[PDB]
Amino acid sequence: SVNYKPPAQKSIQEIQELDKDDESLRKYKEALLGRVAVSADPNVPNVVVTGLTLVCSSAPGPLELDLTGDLESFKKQSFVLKEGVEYRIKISFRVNREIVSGMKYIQHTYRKGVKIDKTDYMVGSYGPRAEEYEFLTPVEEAPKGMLARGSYSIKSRFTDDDKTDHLSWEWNLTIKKDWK
Amino acid sequence: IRKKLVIVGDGACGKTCLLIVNSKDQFPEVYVPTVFENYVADIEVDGKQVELALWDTAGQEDYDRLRPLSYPDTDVILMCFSIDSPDSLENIPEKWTPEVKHFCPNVPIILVGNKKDLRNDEHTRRELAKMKQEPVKPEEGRDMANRIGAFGYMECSAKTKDGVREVFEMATRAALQARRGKKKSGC
Numbered sequence: 001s002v003n004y005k006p007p008a009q010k011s012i013q014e015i016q017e018l019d020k021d022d023e024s025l026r027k028y029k030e031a032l033l034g035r036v037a038v039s040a041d042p043n044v045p046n047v048v049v050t051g052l053t054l055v056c057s058s059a060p061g062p063l064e065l066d067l068t069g070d071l072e073s074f075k076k077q078s079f080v081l082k083e084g085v086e087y088r089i090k091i092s093f094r095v096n097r098e099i100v101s102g103m104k105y106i107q108h109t110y111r112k113g114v115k116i117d118k119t120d121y122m123v124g125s126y127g128p129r130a131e132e133y134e135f136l137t138p139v140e141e142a143p144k145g146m147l148a149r150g151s152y153s154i155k156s157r158f159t160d161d162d163k164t165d166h167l168s169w170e171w172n173l174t175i176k177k178d179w180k
Numbered sequence: 181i182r183k184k185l186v187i188v189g190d191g192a193c194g195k196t197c198l199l200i201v202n203s204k205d206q207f208p209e210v211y212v213p214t215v216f217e218n219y220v221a222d223i224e225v226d227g228k229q230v231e232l233a234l235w236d237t238a239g240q241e242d243y244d245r246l247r248p249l250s251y252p253d254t255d256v257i258l259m260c261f262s263i264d265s266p267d268s269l270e271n272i273p274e275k276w277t278p279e280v281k282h283f284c285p286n287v288p289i290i291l292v293g294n295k296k297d298l299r300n301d302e303h304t305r306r307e308l309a310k311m312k313q314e315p316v317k318p319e320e321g322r323d324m325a326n327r328i329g330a331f332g333y334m335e336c337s338a339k340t341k342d343g344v345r346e347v348f349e350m351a352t353r354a355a356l357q358a359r360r361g362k363k364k365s366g367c
């Protein structure tokens with residue numbers, strides 16, 4: 001509103017041429033830046049979403065989802081986050097052959113079966129590259145309080161301008177008093 | 181200290197010449213590149229010392245396809261039209277504003293009216309008069325700035341250099357804010 005656109009390659013170339021040186025140169029340068037691519041073839045796929053990672057300095061262990069693997073098993077596990085702690089969500093992906101415009105990372109969070117949040121993040125236009133991309137979201141905080149602690153379930157969607165489903169997956173986030 | 185600027189707006193509204201003037205202190209009278217690339221501007225803006233990277237973009241149609249790659253990580257947008265082109269100004273709310281809100285949701289915008297030297301230029305006034313137009317007025321640029329949520333509206337002339345220095349100082353302020361713003365956140 002926005003737108004768308006686209007275209008381419010051529011354209012660138014053309015531118016460158018224109019022429020040269022011149023312017024162209026420048027343109028180329030630018031382209032370169034864007035660049036480259038790878039492849040061519042376509043178938044392959046042009047975009048391969050490889051992983052999700054919660055960048056959290058306070059966390060005693062790893063917090064990464066290998067998205068090239070089995071996605072269902074994630075529903076039987078969870079990520080534990082202590083209440084109030086800051087963290088960013090890193091989406092690791094590869095743009096292999098063509099330039100992708102208006103990339104968007106969407107999260108709709110659920111508590112006890114019902115959807116309680118919807119958040120869209122603007123990733124941008126990305127040209128092909130041999131090297132993987134890592135998109136960081138702005139600094140977010142884990143929720144705090146009696147009514148905020150508990151088990152959550154996030155339905156993530158990495159998409160774009162043409163509304164292509166580069167990858168869709170479900171992961172859980174359990175907010176606690178302490179890491180334990 | 182390290183900040184990213186992206187400059188956007190209609191073809192031929194004077195973006196590249198503005199960046200060249202800011203950078204080299206002289207208007208390019210003969211050759212002008214489609215995009216002026218890789219330049220980091222040293223700006224002192226009261227208190228710090230900023231390194232402001234200047235990312236130029238273009239259209240002319242297909243440069244359309246690359247522009248998106250310019251927006252990751254910007255700290256401040258200069259969104260331009262030219263004061264000799266009422267058409268360029270309507271593109272602000274019609275094209276450039278949705279594009280930049282899409283790619284840079286919460287980055288501050290400075291709306292800039294370029295070619296301010298043409299506002300009383302005789303050939304410009306003649307050419308526009310024949311279309312029952314006239315140069316953009318400052319009030320219009322300020323109200324467009326208001327409408328689109330800009331951090332502010334400024335005018336300059338790359339040709340005479342009037343107002344250029346202040347454009348980049350305000351963009352730098354804006355960027356420092358952003359951071360612061362951032363913280364814040366938302367978701």
Ligand SMILES: Nc1nc2c(ncn2[C@@H]2O[C@H](COP(=O)(O)OP(=O)(O)O)[C@@H](O)[C@H]2O)c(=O)[nH]1
Pocket residue numbers: 189190191192193194195196197198212213214294295296297298336337338339340
């Ligand atoms: N009168 C006048 N012309 C200018 C000014 N700045 C640029 N120009 C001219 O406008 C045309 C377009 O300039 P350019 O910077 O390439 O615009 P771009 O397509 O937005 O980068 C060229 O012919 C420039 O000489 C200015 O401040 N005053």
Ligand SMILES: [Mg+2]
Pocket residue numbers: 192195196197213214215216237238
């Ligand atoms: Mg140009």
